[PDB]
Design an enzyme around this catalytic site. Structure first.
Site, short mmCIF file in Angstrom:
data_model
loop_
_atom_site.label_atom_id
_atom_site.label_comp_id
_atom_site.label_asym_id
_atom_site.label_seq_id
_atom_site.Cartn_x
_atom_site.Cartn_y
_atom_site.Cartn_z
CG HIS A 12 -2.01 -0.83 1.11
ND1 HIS A 12 -3.14 -1.51 0.16
CD2 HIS A 12 -1.43 -2.39 1.71
CE1 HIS A 12 -3.15 -2.76 0.94
NE2 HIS A 12 -3.03 -2.96 1.58
CE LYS A 41 -4.96 -7.31 -1.27
NZ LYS A 41 -4.36 -5.58 -1.77
CG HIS A 119 -6.90 -4.80 7.12
ND1 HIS A 119 -6.74 -5.27 6.04
CD2 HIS A 119 -7.56 -3.71 7.38
CE1 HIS A 119 -8.43 -4.65 5.64
NE2 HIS A 119 -8.57 -3.77 6.76
CG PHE A 120 -6.05 0.92 2.36
CD1 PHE A 120 -7.26 0.71 2.27
CD2 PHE A 120 -5.21 2.00 2.92
CE1 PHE A 120 -7.81 2.18 1.81
CE2 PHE A 120 -5.89 3.41 2.74
CZ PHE A 120 -6.86 3.39 2.19
CG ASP A 121 -11.21 -1.34 7.16
OD1 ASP A 121 -11.27 -2.33 7.15
OD2 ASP A 121 -12.10 -0.54 7.22
#
Length: 124
Positions: A12, A41, A119-121
């Site tokens: 990211h 992905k 994590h990217f949410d």
DNA sequence: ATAA
């Protein structure tokens, strides 16, 4: 092993540029970061800020993650981000993605000591 | 369809 922290940085972060260059930005970046190794992905977001500015989000607005977990945070400010989604015509191995450049709040989940994005949410 |  690859740490979740480093895995967040590889998938990211893209500090070098302040924005996505071409409509083809995502087709090269997603392949060079290796997110198309076994499956394409389907959605991935790249943040164009300093590691320091993104890390800092972990000390900001605590919010619920999209899935119910309590450990997500959103930036007080808006950040440069390139969302990448695979198109209807994408077929592994030649994954095709649509590149969108936007300036908005990112929501990341954090873990550890140091408390780092893991994590990217979501963005909003 | 974005974390283990």
């Amino acid at each position: 092993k690859e740490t979740a922290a480093a895995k967040f940085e590889r998938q990211h972060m893209d500090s070098s540029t302040s924005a996505a260059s071409s409509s083809n930005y995502c087709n090269q970046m997603m392949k060079s970061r290796n997110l198309t190794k076994d499956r394409c992905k389907p959605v991935n977001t790249f943040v164009h800020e300093s590691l320091a500015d993104v890390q800092a989000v972990c000390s900001q607005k605590n919010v619920a993650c999209k899935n119910g977990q309590t450990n997500c945070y959103q930036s007080y400010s808006t950040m440069s981000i390139t969302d990448c989604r695979e198109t209807g015509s994408s077929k592994y191995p030649n994954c095709a993605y649509k590149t969108t450049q936007a300036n908005k709040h990112i929501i990341v989940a954090c873990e550890g000591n140091p408390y780092v994005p893991v994590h990217f949410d979501a963005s909003v």
